[PDB]
A paper describes a structure:
For instance, the U5 snRNP 200 kDa helicase (SNRNP200; Brr2p in yeast) unwinds the initially extensively base-paired U4 and U6 snRNAs during spliceosome activation and releases U4 snRNA and all U4/U6-associated proteins, necessitating re-assembly of the U4/U6 di-snRNP and the U4/U6-U5 tri-snRNP after splicing. SNRNP200 comprises an auto-regulatory N-terminal region (residues 1–394), followed by a helicase region (residues 395–2129; SNRNP200HR) composed of tandem helicase cassettes (N-/C-terminal cassette, NC/CC). Both helicase cassettes comprise dual RecA-like NTPase domains, a winged helix (WH) domain, a helical bundle (HB) domain, a helix-loop-helix (HLH) domain and an immunoglobulin-like (IG) domain. Only the N-terminal cassette (residues 395–1324; SNRNP200NC) is an active ATPase/RNA helicase, while the C-terminal cassette (residues 1282–2136; SNRNP200CC) is catalytically inactive and serves as an intra-molecular regulator of the NC helicase activity.
C9ORF78 is recruited to the spliceosome at a later stage and has been found associated with spliceosome preparations enriched for the step 1 spliceosome (C complex), regulating usage of alternative 3’-splice sites and other alternative splicing events. Like TSSC4, both proteins also contact the SNRNP200 CC. Notably, the binding site of TSSC4 binding region 4 (residues 303–318) overlaps with a binding site of FBP21 and C9ORF78 regions at the Sec63 unit of the SNRNP200 CC. Moreover, all three proteins employ an F-R (F315-R316 in TSSC4; F8-R9 in C9ORF78) or L-R (L369-R370 in FBP21) motif to engage in similar contacts with the F1983, E1944 and E2119 residues of SNRNP200HR. This observation supports the idea that the SNRNP200 CC serves as a latching point for diverse intrinsically disordered proteins (IDPs) that either function during snRNP assembly (TSSC4) or during different stages of the splicing cycle (FBP21, C9ORF78). Mutually exclusive binding of the three proteins to SNRNP200 may serve to prevent premature interactions during U5 snRNP assembly (TSSC4) or support ordered recruitment of regulatory proteins during splicing (FBP21 and C9ORF78). FBP21200–376 was fully displaced by GST-TSSC4 while, due to an excess of SNRNP200HR–C9ORF78 over GST–TSSC4 in case of the SNRNP200HR–C9ORF78/GST–TSSC4 mixture, a small amount of binary SNRNP200HR–C9ORF78 complex eluted from the SEC column in addition to SNRNP200HR–GST–TSSC4 and isolated C9ORF78. These observations indicate that TSSC4 exhibits a higher affinity to SNRNP200HR compared to FBP21200–376 or C9ORF78 and prevents binding of the latter two proteins.
Numbering used by the authors:
A (entry chain J): 2070 to 2335
B (entry chain B): 403 to 2128
C (entry chain C): 5 to 58
The structure:
């Protein structure tokens, strides 16, 4: 469609949402862990997002010394992906790299087109599938952070899956908006904080780019990729949409009658 | 400072530009008639009769001019009339000229005559031209004319060996273009923008001639460029007093005398004006003016007008028709062909085949593939830009042979190629101007050039020209073509931009300077002549005859306009101007101030590509661009196909500009003429506009927007999106191949891995695979690797190694490739540091190292990103993450010692009465630092460390320690160490006059020689030495008892451990500590240094307690320091230096107007250059000799002592300069003048900062960067040199504060303040210079095994600093185990290196023992690498030719300086030396020292710098040669040892071995040798013992000149020896053989050897050698010094054979011809 | 008795160009080995990526 232009124009103004970021305050249980997300990576992750299509990124971090309850998030890993407004499709292979062996997986963060009072069934299904496929993701350590786009700002909330949630999500095969057997008891909300005390970093695929929304046919759930230390490109970067730049008939006799003036300063 | 009123410049400007006619009525020649037919009326002006030749007037034959000018005029019988008139003024006088002649009269040949004059000023000798002595600038209005000028001048001036070239290209392409060529042909805009960028700065002194071709362009909108250029040139002529000749070529138009006045042309001599009667071919111009109003009929009329005019000349004259646009050419040709064919078939004779008399050639040439195929058979043709290159030359050649009867063309034909025609018809005269945004009449210059082609010079009696135009514009062309259109100035419109350019260049500093600058503009002359035309009333003119007030008002308005747009900071009060970054960028890229304001408002860090295109579209250069109704469907269609979205409606002009630029980059096809013109205009401006945006964003440090802007600049340049395949940039690839390559979803980086077969198969076509592979490996590519080491907790030192990884091709990559080095933070949002990197073709596939400092912060970032991005290649970036995960920042350092507020200490505090007299007169009280430290230093006996900024009287603390030592013992021994020899001499004279006189204590200064040092140490009480001399002396401290028993060891400037030559100081200090450990009588150590951040480490290393460590903050200095830093953002160092000359003078005026000033410059020549520049800049100002503070008469006696002519001239004007080449007497005299106050400015080179004792008020450090030719790069000053330079600003008595101005690149500005306002951290570099000291300790048996080496390293400052800052020393941990492992690895690698070079021997794996190579390396204090080189290269057959090379390759010469332009001198020298060098690298210091050694041996004459380098080389030559002799003797080879001895004895005398022995006699030349040779004398003895009368008869000279010659023979070695074998009869095989040699000289020694051509004072050295010549074996050798008599015994083992003979050699090292040899035999028994 | 070293260089016995080339070769290879002995200052980037081996 030709509607990507208005979306690109809107996404060019995502740095304005960066100023106002609201962390949801709730009835915390304070029995499990608490997670600290540095503001710089959140700012960049919002800036590279799109209002209509969700993007996702794996969370990697470590617990600081003599304080195991808190979990500092140190890295956000962007992987080849293509997103729908209600779900994000990302490959089965979890990111692996020498730089990430020291740290541990803490979950994944994804943007959301609109504010939702409850965690979407697609998110719990995806998290349960990831946990089932990979034993490295602990049931209680991993979380889901949803960064909804409120009017003029963005509110982000963390969630955790109960064992019943894992049990239901692993066997779930329905991609509908309201699957059967889904109840709020599956997930629990987890306290999280933003901080400027420390800085995080990004990791992006070594080959090509992390975004396959435009080149959808090239994305296959079984694809393999390698990571690197680099900052991600914006959603509507030129690299991400080659079908708009590459295909162009190169003129030969177009310039035969081109107007002639001398570039004196050249 | 008048009451300025603001004038609106928009009112004053002449609208409609070049079409403004100040002419009132335009009366026309006598023959004329206006007749009307149908819708128009014609005006005819008959051709003027040529002016008859005057009396005694005749054309000049070519043979009648100077002989050198004869070449360059071949093929011409005679000069024409105009050239005949002008040849005298052009060739004989060096006077400014203005030639006003009708077009086509041969003004280019007059310009050629002026160029030949300038060339003849350099005829050199033997018919050669000094190519590098001059440059000529030829300014031409059109590029198509520039190319033809280049071609023609290359053809004409070929025989002179002179290269002419166009100036087009990138600035760094033009930088190497200009240096290559001698004649530069360029447009006014190109030359102006190059001058604005500063690219003309380097060669501006070589420009002697400037030619302003078609100078009547002043009337055009481009005229302000000419005014700026000429005014700048003339004003610079006045400013620098240099002479530049300006030649102006113009058409015959009114106000020519005003142009002559503007060009500084004398009307009586240099003004030549010729009317239309002097045109070579009479021209019967005809005008037609159409009165039709509606466009369709008016255009319909013109067709039959051209047809009717064509039919007149149908069968007899080649008609040439011009059309406005490229497409109109074919349309007009087809229209005229159809019109002539359809009616009555006029084409029959219009072609006139005459039964194919001529048509056959065109019928043969019909085999084309264009629309020219249709027209050519009928005789018509079209010539326009485009077509094909072959088609244009085909049509040109076919027209030159009178085949094409009618040729319609565009305006480029007239400018490009000289193709005259009998008749020319100008059709339309209405062109579309994209800048104006509408249809405008075409320029006057174009009309003149196009109508100057009417009539062929020799085939035409008279050629007419028809001009077709609207009747409303007929009078303008009547005026223009009949020399009645005045040349007016257009400067008012562009005044603010040119004023900003002048401010940025630094030419104008305030309003007065701007008024003076306007005084030279053509606008000023025009306002003077015609005030009423320029809005000046006659009474206003009477008010001020010189128009001072009006010029000031104009300047005030321009300054206000610039200030409003933030281009300049201008205050109305003083009228001063301050350059802003926006102003600099606008000047460099030639953009108007409104565009700069728009960019400043709109640009933001968070800008995206959409808003970037929006910002570009909102530029003010496009203010006249509007969207038209007809070009709306096409714009709408293009809107969907462009990639970047546009958030504006199509009706706005900004959206049109944006989508148009995108369509250009996307290479879309456009079908509108106006649309295509707009596209061409916007895209040609886009280069400069986007480059300016990129510079702005880069300066503000916005990384994310910087990347986008640079990529967009590259996309506009290459006309392709970055997503496309990078191989498109090589235009040789087929389009299909690249399209297929990028069709596959493919990463470009994968192509590197594949070979040529896989690349071909991968594209499903193997035949192209090899070419694709070649082009892939031609693509630029760099490999990055960083070794960063933390300096302090807030800064990191990063060295980046860039290694090219691509095959270099001259045709593709050009002379050089440019890259941008960017380091960014984690988020890639801010640029921490950036710098321009230029890769040279000759230095390709060489590793380049770039060192810079980046800051860090408390929230330690996870990593930094280092990006190296190509300047003009897409997808040519390399990124290297620099992780900080395992970085260990250095220890946090404790605060400096607090200055206790104590009452000043009286000198009477010292109880002893004798000491008080030393300081009683100097001062009554010790200053606060000395008072605070006094108790500890004077009264306590413990080690003390004093750290204070230089100039705080730290030496008095050492004096306190010395006086304390004197109290301890009546006879004491103190050793004072200073890293610099010059500082050592300064301290020596001070302490000598302080102690040896007042206290009568022995104060001595150590020299290089060892025995003299031992004697001085034995007799002296206060030892003064450098680290190297004391290291030599104290290496064998176990042998020398005097070294052990020293009471006090004072080390000064101990912060220089972190600098070069620091490891020696560290080693000697550690050795003193270790020695004091074992003596059982502690050696007190007093360490004096600058403020150290880590003074605790130094105190711990040297044993100073915490309470006796005084580390003071740099603000404790008694004289407060006012330090200012200026940043000059010029990547080119030469350009930076040249441009920063005037700022030095401005700083002198502002900070120290009447107080002494010291200027520090990097190089030796820069001293003289800067002195001359300061003199010329103050002379250009009103006040001359302001710096001289005394009458010349009293300083006259000082001049005759000087021997430098240039220095004499500068001294008379109050400015001196100091450098190494000056003799010590001259330097001390200039310093005496500076101290006395006679002169207040000295320009000292960087190296002299240590060895200079003068105090000033203001110290100016010019560049803080020097050239290292060994690495062909620039390296900044060490921070210690900067500290020493800054410390010279201390004048405690006269001054109350010390100013210091540090000028440098913009990048270093942040580092300088951080490390100059705070205490300095010092590290250790002993881990790199470890081999020599370990070798020395192994030789002296201090280190006997590996554990000894580890324990030895436990005593160093390196051991202390390894734990404090581990990552600086490549240590990955702080644990004790890590330190032990690293130390063991270091002492393992060093011992392995020594064992590999045979310096030592490692038995088993623990013990180490010295070998002979190590012993001779330690003996002569020579780097072990040099000894290894000698051992590996010397063989049994090396002769002197190889010895020179081997000596040249020693590591002692590794630091011989390499300077700019020395390659030419080295090549010229290598051409002359007796031994040539096979393919030598001229940036290699070893090649240079080989050449200098050969030149010195050949007594060749060299420049002063090369002479000083020769002195430096010869200083170490003798030690190196003695080392070579020892190596050869150890190996047992005899012939090369004798060769080395001869090499020594002939380097001393500076002669080759083949030269006559008598050459070493003083005042002897070849003629004297020639006279001596025939007489039969060949040796010095044969005249030493010869008659005085005969010797003075054969030698003709003054008695004074022969007295020293006779005395030389007295000093010449006259010795003889006797030898005997002790019990030669009782000699058995394998037994010891003792041979005794006794030599007594006869004449007594009167002094040292007489070697006038040698730097140092040599001493008689000898060699006694026993060997067998037959076997070429050196049996024994012993080196000695002979005083008056000597005895030498040589021992060896007798061989098995009973009978053996040996030849006893006796060689010298200072004299030649005194070597003796004797033959003896030994009788060996069983 | 007073015999001197009469010089008979004979233009170094027409010194061979190859002999000088061999001396240059030996010097170049030795200097290359000596340059190979040089150690680097500061920690490399890859070292900070990997840190301690164990």
């Amino acid at each position: 469609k030709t509607e990507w232009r208005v979306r690109a124009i809107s996404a060019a103004n995502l740095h304005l949402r960066t100023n106002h970021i609201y962390v949801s305050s709730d009835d915390i249980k304070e029995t499990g862990y608490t997670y600290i997300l540095p503001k710089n990576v959140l700012k960049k992750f919002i800036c590279i997002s799109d209002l209509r299509a969700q993007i996702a990124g794996y969370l990697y971090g470590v617990s600081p010394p003599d304080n195991p309850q808190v979990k500092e998030i140190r890295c956000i890993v962007m992987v080849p992906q293509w997103g729908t407004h209600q779900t994000v499709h990302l490959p089965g292979q979890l990111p692996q790299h020498e730089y990430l062996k020291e740290m541990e997986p803490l979950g994944w963060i994804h943007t959301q087109p609109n504010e939702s009072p409850q965690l979407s069934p697609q998110d719990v299904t995806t998290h349960a599938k990831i946990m089932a496929d990979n034993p490295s993701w602990d049931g209680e350590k991993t979380i889901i952070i949803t960064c909804s786009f409120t009017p003029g700002s963005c509110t982000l909330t963390a969630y955790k899956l109960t064992p019943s949630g894992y049990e239901w999500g692993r066997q779930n095969t329905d991609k509908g908006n309201n699957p059967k057997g889904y109840l709020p008891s599956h997930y629990e909300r987890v306290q999280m904080l933003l901080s400027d005390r420390f800085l995080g970093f990004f990791m992006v695929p070594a080959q090509s780019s992390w975004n396959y929304n435009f080149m959808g046919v090239r994305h296959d759930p079984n694809m393999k990729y390698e990571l690197q230390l680099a900052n991600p490109k914006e959603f509507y970067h030129e690299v991400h949409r080659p079908s708009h730049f590459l295909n162009f008939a190169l003129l030969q006799e177009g310039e035969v009658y081109s107007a002639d003036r001398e570039d004196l300063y050249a | 400072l008048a009451p300025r009123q603001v004038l609106d410049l928009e009112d004053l400007v002449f609208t409609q530009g070049s079409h403004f006619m100040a002419n009132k009525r335009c009366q026309l020649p006598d023959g004329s008639f206006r007749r009307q037919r149908k819708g128009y009326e014609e005006v005819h002006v008959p051709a003027l009769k040529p002016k008859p030749f005057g009396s005694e007037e005749q054309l000049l034959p070519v043979e009648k001019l100077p002989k050198y000018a004869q070449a360059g005029f071949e093929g011409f019988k005679t000069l024409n009339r105009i050239q005949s008139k002008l040849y005298r003024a052009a060739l004989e006088t060096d006077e400014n000229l203005l030639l006003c002649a009708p077009t086509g009269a041969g003004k280019t040949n007059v310009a050629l005559m002026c160029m030949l004059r300038e060339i003849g000023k350099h005829i050199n000798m033997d018919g050669t031209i000094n190519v590098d002595d001059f440059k000529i600038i030829y300014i031409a209005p059109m590029r198509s004319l520039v190319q033809e000028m280049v071609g023609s001048f290359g053809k004409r001036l070929a025989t002179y060996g002179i290269t002419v070239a166009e100036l087009t290209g990138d600035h760094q392409l033009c930088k190497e273009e200009i240096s290559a060529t001698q004649i530069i042909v360029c447009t006014p805009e190109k030359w102006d923008i190059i001058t604005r960028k500063g690219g003309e700065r380097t060669y501006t002194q070589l420009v002697r001639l400037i030619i302003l071709d078609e100078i009547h362009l002043l009337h055009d909108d481009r005229g302000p460029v000419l005014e700026a250029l000429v005014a700048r040139a003339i004003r610079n002529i006045e400013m620098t007093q240099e002479d530049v000749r300006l030649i102006g070529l113009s058409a015959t138009l009114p106000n020519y005398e005003d142009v002559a006045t503007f060009l500084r042309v004398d009307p009586a001599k240099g003004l030549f004006y010729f009317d239309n009667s002097f045109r070579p071919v009479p021209l019967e111009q005809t005008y037609v003016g159409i009165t039709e109003k509606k466009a369709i009929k008016r255009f319909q009329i013109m067709n039959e007008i051209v047809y009717e005019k064509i039919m007149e000349h149908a069968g007899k004259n080649q008609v040439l028709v011009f059309v406005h646009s490229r497409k109109e050419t074919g349309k007009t040709a087809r229209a005229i062909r159809d019109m002539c064919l359809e009616k009555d078939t006029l084409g029959l004779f219009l072609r006139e085949g005459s039964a194919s008399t001529e048509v056959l050639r065109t019928e043969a040439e019909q085999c084309k593939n264009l629309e020219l195929k249709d027209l050519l058979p009928y005789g018509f043709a079209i010539h326009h830009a485009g077509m094909t290159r072959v088609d244009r030359t085909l049509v040109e050649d076919l027209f030159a042979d009178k085949h094409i009867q009618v040729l319609v063309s565009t305006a480029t034909l007239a400018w490009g190629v000289n193709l005259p025609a009998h008749t020319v018809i100008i059709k339309g005269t209405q062109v579309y101007s994209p800048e104006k945004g509408r249809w405008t009449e075409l320029g006057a210059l174009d009309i003149l050039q196009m109508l100057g082609r009417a009539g062929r010079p020799q085939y035409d009696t008279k050629g007419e020209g028809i001009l077709i135009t609207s009747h409303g514009e007929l009078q303008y062309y009547l005026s223009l073509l009949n020399q009645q259109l005045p040349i007016e100035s257009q400067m008012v419109s562009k005044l603010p931009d040119m004023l900003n350019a002048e401010i940025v260049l630094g030419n104008v500093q305030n309003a007065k300077d701007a008024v003076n600058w306007l005084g030279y503009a053509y606008l000023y002359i025009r306002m003077l002549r015609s005030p009423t035309l320029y809005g000046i009333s006659h009474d206003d003119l009477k008010g001020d005859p010189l128009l001072d007030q009006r010029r000031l008002d104009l300047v005030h308005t321009a300054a206000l306009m610039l200030d409003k747009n933030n281009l300049v900071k201008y205050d109305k009060k003083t009228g001063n101007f301050q350059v802003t970054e926006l102003g600099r960028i606008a000047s460099h890229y030639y953009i108007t101030n409104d565009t700069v304001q728009t960019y400043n408002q709109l640009l933001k860090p968070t800008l995206s590509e959409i808003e970037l295109f929006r910002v570009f579209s909102l530029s003010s250069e496009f203010k006249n661009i509007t969207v038209r109704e007809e070009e709306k469907l096409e714009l709408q269609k293009l809107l969907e196909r462009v990639p970047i979205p546009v958030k504006e409606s199509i009706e706005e002009p900004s959206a049109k500009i944006n989508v148009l630029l995108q369509a250009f980059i996307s290479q879309l096809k456009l079908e509108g003429f106006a649309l295509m013109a707009d596209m061409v205009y916007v895209t040609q401006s886009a280069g400069r506009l986007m480059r300016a945006i990129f510079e702005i964003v880069l300066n503000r440090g916005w990384a994310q927007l910087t990347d986008k802007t640079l990529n967009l600049c590259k996309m506009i340049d290459k006309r392709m999106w970055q997503s496309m395949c990078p191989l498109r940039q090589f235009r040789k690839l087929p389009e299909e191949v690249v399209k297929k390559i990028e069709k596959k979803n493919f990463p470009f980086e994968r192509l590197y891995d594949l070979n040529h077969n896989e690349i071909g198969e991968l594209i499903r076509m193997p035949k192209m695979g090899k070419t694709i592979h070649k082009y892939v490996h031609l693509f630029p590519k760099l490999e990055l690797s960083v070794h960063l080491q933390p300096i302090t907790r807030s800064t990191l030192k990063v060295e980046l190694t860039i290694t090219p990884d691509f095959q270099w091709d001259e045709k593709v990559h050009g002379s050089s490739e440019a890259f941008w080095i960017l380091v960014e933070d984690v988020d890639s949002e801010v640029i921490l540091h950036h710098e321009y990197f230029l890769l040279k073709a000759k230095y390709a596939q060489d590793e380049h190292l770039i060192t810079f400092f980046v800051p860090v912060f408390e929230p330690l970032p996870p990593q930094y990103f280092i990006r190296v991005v190509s300047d003009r290649w897409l997808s040519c970036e390399t990124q290297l993450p620099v992780s900080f995960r395992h970085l260990i920042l250095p220890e946090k350092y404790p605060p400096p010692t607090e200055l206790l507020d104590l009452q000043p200490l009286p000198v009477s505090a010292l109880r002893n009465s004798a000491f008080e007299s030393l300081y009683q007169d100097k001062f009554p009280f010790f200053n606060p630092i000395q008072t605070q430290v006094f108790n500890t230093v004077y009264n306590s006996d413990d080690n003390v460390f004093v750290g204070a900024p230089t100039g705080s009287g730290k030496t008095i603390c050492a004096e306190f320690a010395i006086l304390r030592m004197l109290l301890q013992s009546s006879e004491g021994r103190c050793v004072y160490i200073t890293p610099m020899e010059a500082l050592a001499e300064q301290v020596y004279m001070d302490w000598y006059e302080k102690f040896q006189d007042r206290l009568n204590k022995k104060v001595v200064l150590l020299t290089g020689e060892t025995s003299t040092d031992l004697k001085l140490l034995g007799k002296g009480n206060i030892i003064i030495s450098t680290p190297e001399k004391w290291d030599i002396l104290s290496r064998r401290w176990k042998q020398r008892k005097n070294v052990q028993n020293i009471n006090l060891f004072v080390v000064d400037e101990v912060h220089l451990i972190g600098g070069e030559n620091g490891p020696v100081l560290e080693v000697i200090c550690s050795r003193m500590r270790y020695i004091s450990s074992q003596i059982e009588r502690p050696i007190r150590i007093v360490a004096l240094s600058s403020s150290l951040s880590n003074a605790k480490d130094v105190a711990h290393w040297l044993g100073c307690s915490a309470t006796s460590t005084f580390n003071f903050h740099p603000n404790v200095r008694p004289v407060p320091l006012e330090l200012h830093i200026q940043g000059f953002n010029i990547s080119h160092t030469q350009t930076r230096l040249l441009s920063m000359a005037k700022p030095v003078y401005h700083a002198i005026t502002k900070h120290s107007p009447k107080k002494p000033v010291i200027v520090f410059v990097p190089s030796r020549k820069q001293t003289r250059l800067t002195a001359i520049d300061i003199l010329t800049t103050c002379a250009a100002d009103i006040q001359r000799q302001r710096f001289l503070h005394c009458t010349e008469k009293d300083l006259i006696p000082y001049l005759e002592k000087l021997s430098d002519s240039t220095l004499k001239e500068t001294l008379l004007n109050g400015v001196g300069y100091l450098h190494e080449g000056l003799s010590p007497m001259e330097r001390r005299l200039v310093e005496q003048l500076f101290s006395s106050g006679a002169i207040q400015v000295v320009v000292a080179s960087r190296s002299l900062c240590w060895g200079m004792n003068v105090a000033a008020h203001l110290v100016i450090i010019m560049d803080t960067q020097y050239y290292n030719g060994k690495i062909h790069a620039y390296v900044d000053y060490p921070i210690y040199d900067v500290l020493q330079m800054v410390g010279h600003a201390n004048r405690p008595l006269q001054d109350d504060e010390g100013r210091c101005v540090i000028m440098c690149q913009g990048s270093k500005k942040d580092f300088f303040k951080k490390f100059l306002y705070e205490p300095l951290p010092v590290e250790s570099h002993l881990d790199h210079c470890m081999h020599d000291h370990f070798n020395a300790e192994i030789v002296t048996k201090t280190i006997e095994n590996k554990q000894d080496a580890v324990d030895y390293l436990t005593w160093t400052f390196l051991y202390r600093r390894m734990t404090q800052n581990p990552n600086y020393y490549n240590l990955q941990g702080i644990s004790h185990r890590h330190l032990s492992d690293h130390l063991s690895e270091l002492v393992e690698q060093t011992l392995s290196d020594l064992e590999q070079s045979k310096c030592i021997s490692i038995e088993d794996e623990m013990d180490v023992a010295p070998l002979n190579l190590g012993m001779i390396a330690a003996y002569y204090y020579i780097n072990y690498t040099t000894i290894e080189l000698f051992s590996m290269s010397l063989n049994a057959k090396t002769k002197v030719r190889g010895l020179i090379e081997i000596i040249s390759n020693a590591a002692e010469y590794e630091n011989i300086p390499i300077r700019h332009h020395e390659d030419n001198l080295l090549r010229q020298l290598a051409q002359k030396v007796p031994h040539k060098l096979n393919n030598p690298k001229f940036n290699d210091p070893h090649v240079k020292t080989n050449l200098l050694l050969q030149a010195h041996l050949s007594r060749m004459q060299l420049s002063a710098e090369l002479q000083s380098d020769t002195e430096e080389i010869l200083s170490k030559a003798i030690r190196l040669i003695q080392a070579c002799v020892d190596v050869l003797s150890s190996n047992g080879w005899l012939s090369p040892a004798l060769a080395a001895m001869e090499l020594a004895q002939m380097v001393t005398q500076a002669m080759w071995s083949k030269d006559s022995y008598l050459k070493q006699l003083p005042h002897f030349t070849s003629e004297h040798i020639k006279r001596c040779t025939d007489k039969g004398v060949e040796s010095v003895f044969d005249i030493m013992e010869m008659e005085d009368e005969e010797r003075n008869a054969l030698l003709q000279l003054t008695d004074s000149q022969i007295a020293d010659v006779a005395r030389f023979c007295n000093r010449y070695p006259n010795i003889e020896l006797s030898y005997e074998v002790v019990d030669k009869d009782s000699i058995r095989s394998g037994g010891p053989v003792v041979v005794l040699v006794q030599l007594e000289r006869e004449e007594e020694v009167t002094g040292p050897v007489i070697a006038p051509l040698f730097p140092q004072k040599r001493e008689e050295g000898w060699w006694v050698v026993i060997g067998d010549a037959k076997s070429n074996s050196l049996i024994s050798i012993k080196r000695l010094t002979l005083q008056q008599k000597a005895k030498v015994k040589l021992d060896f083992v007798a061989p098995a054979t009973g009978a053996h003979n040996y030849t006893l050699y006796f060689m010298s090292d200072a004299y030649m011809g005194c070597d003796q040899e004797y033959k003896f035999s030994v009788d060996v028994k069983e | 008795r007073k015999i001197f070293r009469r010089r008979r260089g004979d233009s170094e016995s027409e010194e061979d160009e190859q002999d000088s080339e061999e001396v240059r070769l030996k010097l170049e290879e030795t200097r290359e080995v000596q340059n190979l002995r040089k150690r680097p200052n500061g920690v490399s980037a890859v070292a900070l990526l990997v840190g301690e081996k164990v």
